[PDB]
Structure 1
Amino acid sequence: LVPECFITELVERDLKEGKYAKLVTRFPPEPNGYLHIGHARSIVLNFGLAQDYGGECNLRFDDTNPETEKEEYARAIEEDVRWLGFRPTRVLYASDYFETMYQCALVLIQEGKAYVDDLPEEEMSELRAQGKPSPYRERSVEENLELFERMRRGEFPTGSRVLRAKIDPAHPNFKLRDPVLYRIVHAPHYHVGDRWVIYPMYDFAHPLEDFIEGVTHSLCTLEFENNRTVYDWVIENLKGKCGLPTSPRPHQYEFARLDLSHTVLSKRKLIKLVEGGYVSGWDDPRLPTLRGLRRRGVRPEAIVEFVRKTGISRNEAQIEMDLFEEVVRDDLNPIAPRVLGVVDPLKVVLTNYEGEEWIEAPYWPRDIPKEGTRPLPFSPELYIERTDFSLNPPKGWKRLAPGQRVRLRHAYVIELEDVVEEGGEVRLLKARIVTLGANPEDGVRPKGVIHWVSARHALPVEFRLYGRLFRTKDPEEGGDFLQNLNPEALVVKRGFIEPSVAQDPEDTRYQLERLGYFWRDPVDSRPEALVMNRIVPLK
């Protein structure tokens, strides 16, 4: 479930040489937000690798920051992983490892390898900048334990003091100039309540949670390539202590962040969109949250395929939204039954037809190896798209117009008799059936086929037409990102659909001919007042 990549090569070489008995990976998101389509890459990579190689993968909540983290985000994270179809071997919480990380810390302090620092942020980084040592650096092992302990009791306030690793303040690598191991927050944790007041930094917690769980390959994105030298440091200096293995050890590997055109994934901006009412909420289908894509109608299978199709590499190349949209169409093609709806309704009267009939109509075209039919009703009163009639039609006009006849899909051929106007625009069409299952006798075929419904049987529907969220490929770095929003991101139209849809399961996903793929919005739709999101348009 992962194409051969630079990683798949390296896992095989390790397993085959018995460096690790099993592959163990993890997906380790912070529970402070909802997952987007980017996180899908890490999900499929890390979980697929497990099943691909009969290994294990931990769903771990890297919950080291009490300010922002909430249990509902961790509920949601698991809902979104399981929804893409992956079965965590284990669901863990880094926070449940805090006692071990703390004890590890004590060991670093004992061994003259950490120290407590009183200087505030600004001065601390201006000294790093100068490669100078904090004056507090060379404190006695004793002094450090005593103050760390006071830190733990909560005697000092938020920010006031940290523990740093003593590596080298003048070090060629800036990340190694005594990085902060522990900070102070007087704030409760959603998982571990009010127990903790010192909390570890990412660069300390991650390797340790890695190590504790016996992760073998730790896969993360290229942002953390610079964080490798500190990761190694934690493991090497703590291996064999506090119940930890002496061997084997986890090793980090970086792959390329996904970057999707006409979309943004930077949490900061996503927050602006939501709180700004640019978007309705986090599961709004305009969003590339996994929440919103589920609601939009995209099948998890489409997302996993997309991720597998784009592959895994160091190719920072931004992916084009065409591509994603095309994998969705592709995914829906063989399983979305085809029906008729109208989105811009224009009424047509037939003067030479009376009564009703019901036409047997196939859900599936010649290409699809699925048979299946439905009763489709016809009457003297219909709606068509306003967009499929014209008084002044262009050269290649394949649709209805004052001379030109047209094929109602799965039914008769019609021609314009009369146009009825009001307010300088077109209000109704009077037309004439010519042809059911047969060409026109006189041989002048209709140049094209249009969809329709009987005004006499059609159900009303609120269609939500979702476009791409931005008109520019690179809103993320383009500068004015809100001035690049697409005003057609959502177009709400009130239309009609053939009544057959009422006898379907509510998660049925349709293609409405000549419009795109659609399904009932799972939140709002009610059978007595249908609401239908467009999943993706046609090509």
Structure 2
Amino acid sequence: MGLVPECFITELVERDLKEGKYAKLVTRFPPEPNGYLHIGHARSIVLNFGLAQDYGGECNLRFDDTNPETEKEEYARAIEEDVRWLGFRPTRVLYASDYFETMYQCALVLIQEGKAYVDDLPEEEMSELRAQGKPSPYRERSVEENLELFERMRRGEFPTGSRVLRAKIDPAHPNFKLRDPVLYRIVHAPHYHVGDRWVIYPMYDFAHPLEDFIEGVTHSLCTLEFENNRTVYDWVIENLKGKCGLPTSPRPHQYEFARLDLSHTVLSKRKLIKLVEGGYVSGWDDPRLPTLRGLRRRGVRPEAIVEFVRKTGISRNEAQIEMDLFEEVVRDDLNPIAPRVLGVVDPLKVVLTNYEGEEWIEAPYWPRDIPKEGTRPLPFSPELYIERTDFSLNPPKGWKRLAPGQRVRLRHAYVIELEDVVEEGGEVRLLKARIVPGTLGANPEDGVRPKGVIHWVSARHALPVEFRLYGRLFRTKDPEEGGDFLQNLNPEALVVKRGFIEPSVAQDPEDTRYQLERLGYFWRDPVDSRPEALVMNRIVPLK
């Protein structure tokens, strides 16, 4: 019933809602349109948009776009597309750059109130002074000179980086971040949304609260990196309430949840850019990646992603999440909705000496535990392919599959036993085998049942598939902090096998998610699969 599970945040909202602190609840999701979103961002998406719906409130999608150098509209697009794919419906699609004129008016007021000033000092010198707790020489400049200099910065008289505007708070403040933090910088560079209008851009610490305030956000939800940043957030709110058309009340407040860190995966933009550019991975939608794009392409359903996020909870509890966990939620999400078909990944041929012609078998798509009914014609014939790995000349103790004195059950059809093994070049190339005569939907006459069941497909009927077998992207549980990050890659992240799958798949809609028995879950890769050249990704293996 509650999309977001119980925690400090639900409680806090519920309290303030009931006590009339705010009329409606207003969250935002605010990413930077300068990259693609990943599984970590999903936590912020489910949280922020989830509360809006859980409590009959609003949630804005807003591109926090104050860094013109890197930011592109295609990232804005991609962001909106992944947000909706997760199933969420932003109340508004907003861009912080539409706020600039208001933010600039706000800076004027700061300066008229003697609350900001222009700093001519170079960057290196400014941080030595901050480190020393000393004031800029320029700090006690006048309202008049500051407005003229700020205007001269607006005009783009000064080059990129050369002057900045800073609030006047306390140069010796114990919170280092309150030492006259920077409000405005100079970048002679055009913005993807608003163009060549501005040469002065605000810093995060100043624009973010103001975007919040402007939108009447009630609960601005951020991850825990903004711990010491909270004090400046309040400072901007408090010195500007009821100014330049801002409300005097109510006002937004920050609250902090733990960012997701998932085992076996890196989420930092730096490292991700590394992997794409250096061709370690094929592209931003690569199913090896934890981008939302890549998880989509992989076959993961948005419902598993939401559920994953929901399942794991919202807290201050920055404990790393095990990939085991994620994999199990995918498996669980696909269990009742993935019809079971049969395909072969490492094909090995088996010829049946005591069988001729064809015959077609009603086979169930759903196992006993799944309430769905559904059936399909499964072709059988004297030539099949089985997994190479379901055959031993030298089987171990447990061996439940096919061997030189061990019968086996072909799933949904006959028991066969081995008769001859043709070898060529040391390794095995074709099985010669026999059906045990009355074993279609029945045991052998002699009572010695087959120890196990293996999957198979008719070599006379089956479709070629390119299988893209995905694993975790790293071997080590902790790649994101571990030292050599590229030395921890899993060489098995992608194996590509050429294989076979039963012909029925051809009569299914392209977006079907299948369970290949004893193999894992699978679906047509949305980019490269074609009906005449099938390509299927393994979404996840079995438990």
Asked if TM exceeds 0.5, the reply is yes
- Alignment partners' CA distance in 2, 1:120 and 1:281: 40
- Alignment partners' CA distance in 2, 1:518 and 1:77: 26
**Which residue of 1 is the match for residue 529 of structure 2?**
525
- Alignment partners' CA distance in 2, 1:406 and 1:188: 69
Query: What do residues 407-438 of structure 1 show as CA deviations (whole Å, max 9, x unaligned)?
Result: 00000000000111111000000000110000
Query: What do residues 132-178 of structure 1 show as CA deviations (whole Å, max 9, x unaligned)?
Result: 00111111111110010010011111001100001010011100000
- Alignment partners' CA distance in 2, 1:340 and 1:411: 12
- Alignment partners' CA distance in 1, 2:366 and 2:242: 63
**Which residue of 1 is the match for residue 44 of structure 2?**
42
User: Match of 2:523, SS?
Assistant: strand
User: Match of 1:80, SS?
Assistant: helix
CA apart distance, 1:472: 0.5
**Which residue of 2 is the match for residue 509 of structure 1?**
513
CA apart distance, 1:9: 0.5
CA apart distance, 1:119: 1.1
CA apart distance, 1:236: 0.1
- Alignment partners' CA distance in 1, 2:492 and 2:7: 38
Q: How does 1:18-33 map to 2 (within 5 A)?
A: 18-33=20-35
> 2:478 aligned with 1:479, yes or no?
no
CA apart distance, 1:33: 0.2
- Alignment partners' CA distance in 2, 1:366 and 1:454: 24
- Alignment partners' CA distance in 1, 2:355 and 2:339: 29
**Which residue of 2 is the match for residue 536 of structure 1?**
540
- Alignment partners' CA distance in 2, 1:171 and 1:373: 73
- Alignment partners' CA distance in 2, 1:408 and 1:59: 53
User: Match of 1:532, SS?
Assistant: strand
Task: Return structure 1 stretches of 4+ with deviation > 4 angstroms.
Answer: none
> 2:420 aligned with 1:418, yes or no?
yes
- Alignment partners' CA distance in 1, 2:444 and 2:215: 73
- Alignment partners' CA distance in 2, 1:118 and 1:498: 73
CA apart distance, 1:489: 0.1
Query: What do residues 317-348 of structure 1 show as CA deviations (whole Å, max 9, x unaligned)?
Result: 00000000000000000000000000000000
- Alignment partners' CA distance in 1, 2:491 and 2:398: 29
Normalised by the size of structure 1, how large is the TM-score? Answer: 1.00
RMSD: 0.4
User: Match of 1:127, SS?
Assistant: helix
CA apart distance, 1:8: 0.5
CA apart distance, 1:113: 0.5
Query: What do residues 175-232 of structure 1 show as CA deviations (whole Å, max 9, x unaligned)?
Result: 0000000000011000000001100000000000000000000000000111000000
CA apart distance, 1:494: 0.3
Query: What do residues 487-532 of structure 1 show as CA deviations (whole Å, max 9, x unaligned)?
Result: 0000000000000000000000000000000000000000000000
- Alignment partners' CA distance in 2, 1:181 and 1:446: 75
Normalised by the size of structure 2, how large is the TM-score? Answer: 0.99
User: Match of 1:349, SS?
Assistant: strand
Query: What do residues 284-338 of structure 1 show as CA deviations (whole Å, max 9, x unaligned)?
Result: 0000000000000000000000000001000010000000000000000000000
CA apart distance, 1:67: 0.5
CA apart distance, 1:112: 0.4
- Alignment partners' CA distance in 2, 1:341 and 1:225: 52
- Alignment partners' CA distance in 1, 2:151 and 2:444: 92
> 2:285 aligned with 1:283, yes or no?
yes
- Alignment partners' CA distance in 2, 1:133 and 1:217: 34
- Alignment partners' CA distance in 2, 1:48 and 1:458: 45
- Alignment partners' CA distance in 2, 1:103 and 1:168: 23
- Alignment partners' CA distance in 1, 2:183 and 2:46: 31
CA apart distance, 1:120: 1.3
User: Match of 1:463, SS?
Assistant: strand
- Alignment partners' CA distance in 1, 2:100 and 2:423: 74
- Alignment partners' CA distance in 1, 2:123 and 2:326: 43
Query: What do residues 248-306 of structure 1 show as CA deviations (whole Å, max 9, x unaligned)?
Result: 00000000000000000011000000001000000000000000000000000000000
Residue number among 16, 19, 28 corresponding to 2:18 in the alignment: 16
User: Match of 2:487, SS?
Assistant: helix
Query: What do residues 420-474 of structure 1 show as CA deviations (whole Å, max 9, x unaligned)?
Result: 1111000000000110000000011000000000100000000000000000100
Give aligned pairs, total. 539
> 2:177 aligned with 1:175, yes or no?
yes
Determine what percentage of the aligned residue pairs are the same residue: 100
- Alignment partners' CA distance in 2, 1:192 and 1:216: 27
- Alignment partners' CA distance in 2, 1:348 and 1:204: 71
- Alignment partners' CA distance in 2, 1:419 and 1:196: 77
Query: What do residues 90-128 of structure 1 show as CA deviations (whole Å, max 9, x unaligned)?
Result: 000000000000000000010101001111111100100
- Alignment partners' CA distance in 2, 1:15 and 1:77: 30
Unaligned runs of 5+ in 1: none
**Which residue of 2 is the match for residue 322 of structure 1?**
324
- Alignment partners' CA distance in 2, 1:226 and 1:133: 21
Query: What do residues 50-88 of structure 1 show as CA deviations (whole Å, max 9, x unaligned)?
Result: 000000000000000000000000000000010000000
- Alignment partners' CA distance in 2, 1:72 and 1:403: 61
- Alignment partners' CA distance in 2, 1:135 and 1:392: 84
Q: How does 1:269-348 map to 2 (within 5 A)?
A: 269-348=271-350
CA apart distance, 1:234: 0.2
- Alignment partners' CA distance in 2, 1:487 and 1:440: 44
- Alignment partners' CA distance in 2, 1:449 and 1:340: 12
Query: What do residues 389-424 of structure 1 show as CA deviations (whole Å, max 9, x unaligned)?
Result: 000000000000000000000000000001111110
- Alignment partners' CA distance in 2, 1:140 and 1:312: 47
- Alignment partners' CA distance in 2, 1:473 and 1:130: 41
Unaligned runs of 5+ in 2: none
User: Match of 1:484, SS?
Assistant: coil
Residue number among 378, 381, 384 corresponding to 2:380 in the alignment: 378
User: Match of 1:483, SS?
Assistant: coil
- Alignment partners' CA distance in 2, 1:110 and 1:276: 51
CA apart distance, 1:357: 0.6
User: Match of 2:497, SS?
Assistant: strand
